[PDB]
């Protein structure tokens, strides 16, 4: 048995990856919202610009619609989705370890009962003790059966992911720093 | 006279239709720069919290440095927000609300004027009713026609007073409209829009290198 160790590993990775997920999810959601709000803005500007009678206002609205689009265009999401699924899988493996534990216990207790039934044997009360052992060996074999099944399912069922997140974060940071430097110098006023 | 009044409702109805159109443009511009500074302050707070609760030094620094950057970016959206624009937006939203009040006042004036004209018409039919009953009949019904005329005179003078009162309120509100009409919102919005456009165009050109 190594199950104790392999559970502690899984328990650890699940705690580590859930933390990373919370970082990846704030990054994925922000980029998602920005491309969403910008596409609405651009559509709204083009519609307003189309329905404008003043030529100067009309051109300005439609040119700004064209701009929000060009700038919007200016991989991490695949890594993000692989992470979300892997987290869900770790939850299934731990539930399997939990199942294995509870199934193992039902068996051990039945095994203990059976053993007390055998000590109890060591006329009509002797016949009752005999039929008791036949009912508990029936139970004990099925409970070991239930256990073996779950252990097979368990057998069948982070710090690499993290580096990739750091890489994306650093380039995002740099890119944003350059935009802050540009706006601080060029802010229209 | 009562010709200046009908000409004023024409100008007001027009400006209200024109400014509501402009408002819809200003409101999409105000709402976008509102949401951006909002979402960014939310993002920065979340990044700082996540960065504070991170055990990996490289990841922790990256999250907190990005929070410091989006903090700076938020203040730049706050600096251009408090622009001569976001101020014009509040002036436009209020002026639109005032134009709605002036039209409601013109409406009140119209309905008040009509109550009076109809009472004036009734009164005039009551006077014709005396001309008939005078020689052509007896003082019994002639007394009823006299007291009718005194009740409708009472009404007609009061209704003309009510009308005069509403026309004064319309004149006063016509003065408020003019002070906030002589503000030329349309060219200010265009001016802003063109600088916003230019600014965005220069960012697109700069980012290419």
């Amino acid at each position: 048995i190594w199950f104790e160790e392999k559970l502690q590993e899984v328990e650890c990775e699940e705690q580590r990856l859930r933390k990373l997920h919370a970082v990846v999810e704030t990054l994925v959601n922000h980029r998602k919202e920005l491309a969403l709000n910008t596409a609405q803005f651009a559509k709204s500007l083009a519609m307003l610009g189309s329905s404008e009678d003043n030529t100067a206002l009309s051109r300005a609205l439609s040119q700004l619609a064209e701009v929000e689009e060009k700038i919007e265009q200016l991989d991490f999401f695949l890594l993000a989705e692989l992470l979300s699924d892997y987290i869900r899988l770790l939850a299934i493996v731990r539930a399997a370890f939990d199942q294995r534990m509870k199934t193992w216990q039902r068996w051990q207790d039945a095994q203990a009962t059976l053993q007390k039934k055998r000590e109890a044997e060591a006329p009509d009360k002797l016949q009752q003790a005999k039929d008791e052992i036949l009912e508990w060996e029936s139970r004990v074999t099925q409970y070991e059966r239930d256990f073996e099944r779950i252990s097979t399912v368990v057998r069948k069922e982070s710090k690499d992911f993290k580096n990739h997140v750091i890489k994306y974060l650093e380039t995002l940071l740099y890119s944003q720093q350059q935009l802050a430097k540009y706006w601080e110098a060029f802010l229209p006023e």
Side-chain angles (χ1 to χ4, degrees), chain A:
Chain A
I1 180 272
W2 71 339
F3 289 87
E4 261 258 280
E5 275 145 17
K6 298 292 159 288
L7 171 65
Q8 284 279 34
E9 279 163 35
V10 166
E11 281 178 289
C12 179
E13 288 276 287
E14 203 206 40
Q15 208 168 59
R16 183 181 279 116
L17 297 207
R18 274 189 191 264
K19 274 188 279 183
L20 192 67
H21 187 74
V23 319
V24 172
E25 274 276 293
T26 84
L27 289 174
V28 171
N29 288 350
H30 191 74
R31 156 94 271 97
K32 194 176 79 198
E33 220 182 2
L34 285 183
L36 203 98
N37 297 343
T38 64
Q40 263 86 63
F41 191 50
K43 180 185 213 85
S44 280
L45 289 172
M47 174 271 136
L48 286 153
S50 183
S51 79
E52 182 56 43
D53 290 323
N54 176 294
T55 319
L57 228 188
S58 180
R59 260 169 237 210
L61 294 153
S62 41
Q63 283 181 70
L64 227 213
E66 284 180 54
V67 180
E68 288 291 306
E69 291 174 43
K70 297 257 186 181
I71 274 170
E72 229 296 303
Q73 348 282 189
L74 299 162
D75 255 299
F76 161 81
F77 307 68
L78 307 176
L79 182 84
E81 62 199 23
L82 286 209
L83 179 67
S84 198
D85 178 71
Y86 186 48
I87 270 139
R88 291 292 177 201
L89 168 68
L90 294 179
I92 293 152
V93 177
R94 281 184 79 210
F97 269 96
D98 179 42
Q99 252 300 7
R100 203 191 98 108
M101 185 41 176
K102 315 227 171 104
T103 305
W104 180 86
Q105 262 144 348
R106 192 202 200 166
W107 167 53
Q108 296 294 122
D109 287 15
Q111 207 148 71
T113 287
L114 172 278
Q115 215 251 261
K116 125 178 85 196
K117 290 281 171 82
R118 282 181 180 162
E119 287 170 1
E121 179 155 294
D124 254 74
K125 299 296 183 181
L126 177 63
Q127 197 254 297
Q128 215 281 117
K130 279 189 279 97
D131 282 84
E132 263 324 290
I133 293 149
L134 302 162
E135 224 291 88
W136 289 81
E137 285 160 342
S138 202
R139 285 176 173 254
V140 168
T141 200
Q142 193 205 280
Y143 304 158
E144 187 157 15
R145 220 124 212 175
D146 286 338
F147 173 72
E148 279 182 22
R149 196 192 308 112
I150 194 64
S151 290
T152 295
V153 170
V154 167
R155 295 176 64 186
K156 183 178 179 180
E157 244 94 295
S158 67
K159 291 178 179 168
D160 290 345
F161 261 131
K162 213 177 225 170
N163 293 314
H164 292 313
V165 174
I166 295 158
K167 196 183 180 182
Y168 175 86
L169 260 197
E170 290 174 350
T171 115
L172 213 218
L173 170 62
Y174 176 75
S175 153
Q176 287 308 278
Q177 289 176 321
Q178 301 300 292
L179 193 61
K181 282 157 191 163
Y182 176 93
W183 285 120
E184 170 76 322
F186 303 117
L187 208 266
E189 50 182 299

